[PDB]
């Protein structure tokens, strides 16, 4: 449930039409944490299980509490891991539409990797959802070099990490409803806009 390696375990012959790459929060389990699987369930209902690949960011991404203090909200090693997953999706399945997401430190990681991506690949990312975006205030609510209309930020009232401080209050732990509904909904809508039916 909390670990999905569909891209890593996939190949060109079985390519899905949609590939979702997701980065968990600090200290979360597996490579999807608490929010990732909910998004996944929704995606799988919309596209079939065969029509979508779910991939969490693992490897060098350890989701360390200390890394949040680094200049871009995570280590440069984690940034290289996620960037490498986008490259792999492009290599294995050039025809697939990409979608991404991240929670807390994972939101900073998602933003950093996307900012750094080759524009050709970044163009294929139809939508990105961020929850408890630690760099929300600093990045004025968006991802550098990526279109705003493609980005959706979920920041609860009272979630201090959205207002510039690294302080965890209960609202930061309350994104389950968003992950279960409006987040995957937005993603499906963007993929449908670039693919149709
Ligand atoms: P994020 O990495 O979130 C986890 C606590 C879930 O937290 C920062 C604000 C320390």
Query: Domain of 195: which CATH number?
Result: 3.40.50.1820
Q: Known catalytic residue: 159?
A: yes
**Beta strand 18-23 with 125-131: parallel, antiparallel or unpaired?**
unpaired
- Two tokens, residue 79: 């940034």
Nearest CA residue ID for atom 7, ligand 1: 104
Measured between alpha carbons, how far is 27 from 122 in angstroms, rounded to an integer?
28
Measured between alpha carbons, how far is 36 from 196 in angstroms, rounded to an integer?
25
Annotated active-site residue in 26, 75, 104, 113 = 104
Nearest CA residue ID for atom 1, ligand 1: 104
Q: Known catalytic residue: 50?
A: no
Q: Known catalytic residue: 104?
A: yes
Cβ atoms of 53 and 95 within 8 Å: the answer is no
Q: Report residues whose beta carbon is within 6 angstroms of any ligand 1 atom.
A: 25-28, 65, 68, 104-105, 134, 161, 166, 168
Q: Which atom of ligand 1 is nearest to the CA of 173?
A: 6
CA–centroid distance, 65 to ligand 1, in Å, is: 7
Count: domains in the chain: 1
CA–centroid distance, 136 to ligand 1, in Å, is: 13
- Elucidation technique: X-ray
- Two tokens, residue 153: 């930020």
- Two tokens, residue 2: 């909390």
What is the domain range of residue 34? 1-197
Q: Which atom of ligand 1 is nearest to the CA of 168?
A: 9
CA–centroid distance, 34 to ligand 1, in Å, is: 12
CA–centroid distance, 197 to ligand 1, in Å, is: 38
For residue 11, give the nearest of 84, 92, 72, 98 by alpha carbon: 92
Annotated active-site residue in 26, 38, 67, 172 = 172
CA–centroid distance, 64 to ligand 1, in Å, is: 9
This PDB structure is determined at a resolution in Å of 2.0
């Amino acid at each position: 449930r909390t670990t999905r390696d569909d891209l890593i375990n996939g190949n060109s012959a079985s390519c899905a039409d949609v590939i979702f790459i997701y980065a968990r929060g600090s200290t979360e389990t597996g490579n999807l944490g608490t929010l990732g699987p909910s998004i996944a369930s929704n995606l799988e209902s919309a596209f079939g299980k065969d029509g979508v690949w779910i991939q969490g960011v693992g490897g060098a991404y350890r989701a360390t509490l200390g890394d949040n203090a680094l200049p871009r909200g995570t280590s440069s090693a984690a940034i290289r891991e996620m960037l490498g997953l986008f490259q792999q999706a492009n290599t294995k399945c050039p025809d697939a539409t990409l979608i991404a997401g991240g929670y807390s430190q994972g939101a900073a990681l998602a933003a950093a990797s996307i900012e750094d991506l080759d524009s050709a690949i970044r163009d294929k990312i139809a939508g990105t959802v961020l929850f408890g975006y630690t760099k929300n205030l600093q990045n004025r609510g968006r991802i550098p070099n990526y279109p705003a209309d493609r980005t959706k930020v979920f920041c609860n009232t009272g979630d201090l990490v959205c207002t510039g401080s690294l302080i965890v209050a209960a609202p930061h732990l309350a994104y389950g409803p968003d992950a279960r509904g409006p987040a995957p909904e937005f993603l499906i809508e963007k993929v449908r806009a670039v693919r149709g039916s």
